Amino acid sequence: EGKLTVERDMIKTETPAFSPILEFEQDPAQILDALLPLYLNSQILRALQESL
Amino acid sequence: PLIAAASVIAAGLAVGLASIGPGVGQGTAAGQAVEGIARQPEAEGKIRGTLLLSLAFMEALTIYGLVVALALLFANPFV
């Protein structure tokens, strides 16, 4: 009602993998090691957004 | 029965070796090509054309060995 409110909503993203036709052009292991910086960055930006 | 025997033996050796090697190489060709054509199903026509060129090259070496075998078989000009 008349007070504007805050819902910490949860919609799940697409949980398909990459394709069976898709190939790991460089490495499985190094791409894991790379995405770790990406995922750490994603959670960190989201955390700073959460605090702000 | 000496030089004609030698040419016949040479023909058998040539035919066996020439048909062993490059056809197996053509099998390696066909494996890597058709795997990629099945995964990426886009370029199957250009894949089939290039595969025709590859089978042509490999079977051409095989036919060259077979032709030397038949030339020693049919018209032994050194024997």
UniProtKB/Swiss-Prot annotation, chain A:
Activation can be brought about by a ferredoxin-dependent reduction of the disulfide bond in the light. It is found in: Plastid, Chloroplast thylakoid membrane. Belongs to the ATPase gamma chain family. F-type ATPases have 2 components, CF(1) - the catalytic core - and CF(0) - the membrane proton channel. CF(1) has five subunits: alpha(3), beta(3), gamma(1), delta(1), epsilon(1). CF(0) has four main subunits: a, b, b' and c. Produces ATP from ADP in the presence of a proton gradient across the membrane. The gamma chain is believed to be important in regulating ATPase activity and the flow of protons through the CF(0) complex. This is ATP synthase gamma chain, chloroplastic. The lineage of its organism: Eukaryota, Viridiplantae, Streptophyta, Embryophyta, Tracheophyta.
From Swiss-Prot, chain B:
It is found in: Plastid, Chloroplast thylakoid membrane. The record marks E59 as: Reversibly protonated during proton transport. GO terms for cellular component: chloroplast thylakoid membrane; proton-transporting ATP synthase complex; proton-transporting two-sector ATPase complex, proton-transporting domain. It is a multi-pass membrane protein. One of its GO terms (molecular function) is proton-transporting ATP synthase activity, rotational mechanism. It comes from the Eukaryota. The chain crosses the membrane at residues 1-21, 55-75. F(1)F(0) ATP synthase produces ATP from ADP in the presence of a proton or sodium gradient. F-type ATPases consist of two structural domains, F(1) containing the extramembraneous catalytic core and F(0) containing the membrane proton channel, linked together by a central stalk and a peripheral stalk. During catalysis, ATP synthesis in the catalytic domain of F(1) is coupled via a rotary mechanism of the central stalk subunits to proton translocation. Belongs to the ATPase C chain family. In plastids the F-type ATPase is also known as CF(1)CF(0). This is ATP synthase subunit c, chloroplastic. It comes from Spinacia oleracea (Spinach).
